[PDB]
């Protein structure tokens, strides 16, 4: 029930998954494989720097609630739990080739190439991601694809905590 990825630890509780291989098309139409998790899971993330929560079933982000040390943290952990959930948005957002033969990317497989792709630029992601209105859950606020903090719309399914 406990594992790493991307830095954080992820720690279920609740729910349960099955795992198969799966191909997915890139919004760039590159055939990638992926050991896919099927089945509705929450999990508590913990990193150094950001903690959240998470609801997914399979490849569907459900809710994300994430607090941490600063704009920087929090959207490196909003970032991983996307990858994480496997959404077809999110493999979507991939618009050029993922270069899986250079020296440097042989061990790494697709679901962190991924990774690495948006850590180094998430801005299609987030704009691709989709927005959403939101209601006064005190606490609690909205975070807009640019990062900037909203009472009124967030990105899908994603609110930030006061830390
Ligand atoms: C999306 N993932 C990924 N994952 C876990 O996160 C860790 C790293 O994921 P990964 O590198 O894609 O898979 P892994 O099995 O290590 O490798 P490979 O795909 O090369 O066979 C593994 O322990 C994997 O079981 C998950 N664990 C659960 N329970 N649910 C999920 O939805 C997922």
Redesign the pocket.
């Known amino acids: 029930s406990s594992?790493s990825?991307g830095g954080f630890t992820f720690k279920?509780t609740s729910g349960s998954?099955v795992k198969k291989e799966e191909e997915v098309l890139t919004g760039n139409l590159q055939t990638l494989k992926i050991?896919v998790?099927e089945g509705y899971?929450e999990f508590t993330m913990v990193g150094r720097r950001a903690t959240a929560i998470l609801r997914?079933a399979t490849r569907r982000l459900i809710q994300l609630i994430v607090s941490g040390r600063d704009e920087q943290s929090i959207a490196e952990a909003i970032i991983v739990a996307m990858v994480?959930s496997?959404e077809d948005c999110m493999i979507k957002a991939v618009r050029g080739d993922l270069n899986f033969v250079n020296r440097a990317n042989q061990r790494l497989?697709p679901?962190?190439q991924l990774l690495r792709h948006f850590q180094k630029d998430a801005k299609v992601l987030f704009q691709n991601w989709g927005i959403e209105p939101i209601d006064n859950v005190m606490g609690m606020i909205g975070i807009l694809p640019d990062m900037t903090p909203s009472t009124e719309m967030s990105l899908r399914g994603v609110r930030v905590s006061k830390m």
Do not use: I, L, P
């Open positions: 594992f990825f279920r998954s050991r998790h899971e997914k994480f496997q497989n679901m962190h």
